[PDB]
């Protein structure tokens, strides 16, 4: 286990045996792909192979090393104000839970229909000094599940978190991180959906009727400062203890908007990664 | 207490590390996990399923479907050539393929590969193509004889319909790079007529062949990296 | 990981602490340690070896050697007195002595002590001194009778030559301070004539006695501190 796990030799690939010639009836190279199945032909079948003892692990080819990597999924921003502190909808951020809200990683999952996981969340606040001294800028992140009082503005009554989670980070002390159970009323997170809100010819349809999990209302606790700032707290996300069901063809068209598939670009012709050739004859 | 020394790396953050974190939401008992038909556990699996190949990688064709078929024609001449593509699995036409699309998530690849072709011809129709794998070393062959000299498979179109061509693994370095590299050049594969396409009366004289590529149990990848085949020259709205 | 709490003292530095440190120069195998005659393991050892006492702690004498001899004289009178010094082992003339020099490295001292005297007289010469230890309590005695009343030793100069006087440990506090302190006053020791210094014909009539002080197995020190007996009103060059 150790060795196998430390040496990373858990999932090893078979070796390529030796072959000889075959002047025989059954032709393995011939199958009818219309059966929708996949061929089973190998080196040893087609050629006069040798003998190679392999030693490549398919460890890094596991839904956990494919998925289990932290990725920017949101960049909370706060261009503070000292003029009006508090006021409605200010100096505090709120953002709806999700992804589809950002490619590269969105891309990645979408490779599967259903998915399930606990996550390694990490907050990377970066304090840009627009003043001659930033002081001590404390911070409060927290989670607002449904249906819950989402701060109208900066000091509601909801920042008491008498029964909510609020993580606090003060300049110097390291990045806040933490983790989380798999939050869904369903046995898995619906990375897609072919359902609607209802029969209302104006109902919602997508990944989304099924993902009302939150939002995040933010706060820079410290009170009024002299010299201004702007905070940019980056939100990274990692999938730990993941499972996946029914793979899908990757995405080749740059999306737009989340919780939707829509590609149809604003005017520009739909572009894809495929390159053009002069002729099939020369590559 | 414990006289400790804080080591260099301490306090950092890595998008690639295995560490525990206080779980907010203590005492939460997640929805049970019901049974669901078809769950993956390894990219590999997806890599072993043959996905179709864009090969008619030509001009107007390209944004359409045709971009997938290869019509086997007339051919006044004989021993003429059909097409060619190069093996470097991250190279349009290959790339976009379930495999390619993937491989482009890792820095290095290896093992054998499988190319399969199917005759969307007719029943009464007949043909015999010669497919070949020209290992890395020289130039994609200009002529059949020259190409027949290396790895190949004569394909007899018949009641079967699908011929699968294997691409042995020939390389110096146990491993090849997924990224375009003169060194790690995997070679070319090409197809030519062995005989012809003969059709008895009142049957069309052009027909198509679809082509595919799935992996071999040989196969394996490594060094995960972010993809090539997708630039989000967005953003993404709401 | 391990939910830890960093304790108050943490990150400090103490010129007096036992802690480990990464050794720069990993894999270094130091020169073997050959055998060398005479190695110490305890200050004590050095403290038990009698070093000579400056006692002729007088004016011009002092920068010279004489500063070490005590000439036993004439003495017209009788029952007259020789010298005195006080026991507080950090008090010139004592101090400078291998012992003193040391003790001045610790805050507290204890146990008995040993004073030894030697006759650098003649052979045909004769004498009898009375040495005495006057414990702490009163004033260094003005007269012999008064001093003879406490701890003492009559010394018969003869074929031997060295008389060793012990200084028992008399104190209230198991321990005494090395630093001048009215409380921790150890007392005085003095020497007087019992008889005389008689010399037969044509022999000098003054002669010297050397004196020394080594420790007793009684002895012991503590609370290390930086010395008294050395002010580097330098610096030190190159």
């Amino acid at each position: 286990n150790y060795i196998d796990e430390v040496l990373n030799e858990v999932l090893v690939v078979p070796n390529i045996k030796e072959s000889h010639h075959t002047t025989s009836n059954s032709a393995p190279l011939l199958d009818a792909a219309e059966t929708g199945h996949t061929s089973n032909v190998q080196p040893e079948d087609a050629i006069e192979t040798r003998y190679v003892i392999t030693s490549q692990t398919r460890d890094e080819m596991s839904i956990e090393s494919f998925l289990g990597r932290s990725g920017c999924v949101h960049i909370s921003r706060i261009k503070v104000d000292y003029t009006d502190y508090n006021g409605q909808d200010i100096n505090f951020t709120k953002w709806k839970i999700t992804l589809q809200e950002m490619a590269q990683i969105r891309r990645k999952f979408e490779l599967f229909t259903y998915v399930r996981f606990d996550s390694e969340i990490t907050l990377v606040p970066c304090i840009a000094g627009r003043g001659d001294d930033i002081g001590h800028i404390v911070m409060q992140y927290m989670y607002v599940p449904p249906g819950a009082p989402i701060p109208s503005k900066r000091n509601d009554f909801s920042w008491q978190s008498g029964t909510n989670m609020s993580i606090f980070w003060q300049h110097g002390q390291p990045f806040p991180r933490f983790s989380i159970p798999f939050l869904s009323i369903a046995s898995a997170y619906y990375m897609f959906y072919d359902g609607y809100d209802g029969d209302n010819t104006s109902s919602k349809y997508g990944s989304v009727v099924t993902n009302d999990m939150g939002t995040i209302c933010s706060r820079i606790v410290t009170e009024k400062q002299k010299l201004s700032v702007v905070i940019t707290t980056h939100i990274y996300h990692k999938a730990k203890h993941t499972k996946a069901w029914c793979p899908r063809p990757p995405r080749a068209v740059p999306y737009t908007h989340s919780h939707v598939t829509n590609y149809m670009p604003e005017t520009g012709d739909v572009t894809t990664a495929i390159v053009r050739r002069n002729t099939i004859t020369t590559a | 207490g414990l006289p400790v020394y804080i080591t260099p790396g301490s306090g950092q953050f890595m998008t690639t590390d295995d560490m525990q974190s206080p779980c907010a939401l203590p005492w939460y008992h997640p929805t049970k996990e019901i049974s669901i038909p078809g769950e993956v556990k390894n990219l590999i699996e997806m890599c072993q399923v043959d996905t179709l190949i864009p090969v008619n990688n030509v001009g107007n064709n390209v944004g359409n479907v045709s971009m997938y078929t290869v019509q086997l024609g007339n051919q006044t001449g004989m021993a003429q050539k059909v097409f060619s593509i190069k093996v470097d699995i991250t190279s349009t036409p290959l790339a976009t393929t379930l495999i390619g699309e993937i491989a482009s998530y890792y820095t290095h690849w290896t093992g054998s590969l499988r190319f399969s072709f199917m005759f969307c011809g007719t029943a009464n129709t007949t043909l015999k193509l010669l497919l070949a794998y020209t290992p890395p070393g020289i130039d994609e062959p200009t002529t059949r004889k020259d190409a027949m000299l290396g790895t190949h498979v004569v394909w007899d179109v018949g009641l079967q319909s699908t011929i699968s061509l294997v691409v042995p693994w020939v390389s110096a370095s146990h491993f090849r790079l997924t990224a375009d590299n003169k060194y790690s050049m995997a070679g070319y594969i090409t197809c030519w007529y062995q005989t012809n396409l003969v059709v008895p009366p009142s049957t069309p004289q052009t027909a198509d062949m679809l082509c595919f590529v799935s992996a071999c149990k040989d196969f394996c990848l490594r060094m995960a990296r972010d993809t090539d085949l997708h630039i989000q020259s967005g953003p993404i709205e709401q | 990981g391990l939910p830890v709490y960093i304790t108050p003292g943490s990150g400090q530095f103490m010129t007096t602490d036992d802690m480990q440190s990464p050794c720069a120069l990993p894999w270094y195998h130091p020169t073997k340690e050959i055998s060398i005659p005479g190695e110490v393991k305890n200050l004590i050892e050095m403290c038990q070896v009698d070093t000579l006492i400056p006692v002729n702690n007088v004016g011009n004498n002092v920068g010279n050697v004489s500063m070490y001899t005590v000439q036993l004289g004439n003495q017209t009178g009788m029952a007259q007195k020789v010298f005195s010094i006080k026991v507080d082992i950090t008090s010139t003339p004592l101090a400078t002595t291998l012992i003193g020099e040391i003790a001045s490295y610790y805050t507290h001292w204890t146990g008995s002590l040993r004073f030894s005297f030697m006759f650098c007289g003649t052979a045909n010469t004769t004498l009898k001194l009375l040495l005495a230890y006057t414990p702490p309590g009163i004033d260094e005695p003005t007269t012999r009778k008064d001093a003879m009343l406490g701890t003492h030793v009559v010394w018969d100069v003869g074929l031997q030559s060295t008389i060793s006087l012990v200084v028992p440990w008399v104190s209230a506090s198991h321990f005494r301070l090395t630093a001048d302190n009215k409380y921790s006053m150890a007392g005085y020791i003095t020497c007087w004539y019992q008889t005389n210094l008689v010399v037969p014909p044509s022999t000098p009539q003054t002669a010297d006695m050397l004196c020394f002080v080594s420790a007793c197995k009684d002895f012991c020190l503590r609370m290390a501190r930086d010395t008294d007996l050395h002010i580097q009103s330098g610096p030190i060059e190159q």
Binding site: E5, E64, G68, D118, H241 | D18, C23 | -
Partner: peptide, 19 residues
């Protein structure tokens, strides 16, 4: 060094294993 789930909940733990 391992299996020392310093934290109570299971959701908090390292990347799972492989089998």
């Amino acid at each position: 060094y391992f299996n020392i789930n310093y934290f109570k909940d299971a959701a908090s733990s390292g990347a799972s294993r492989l089998d």
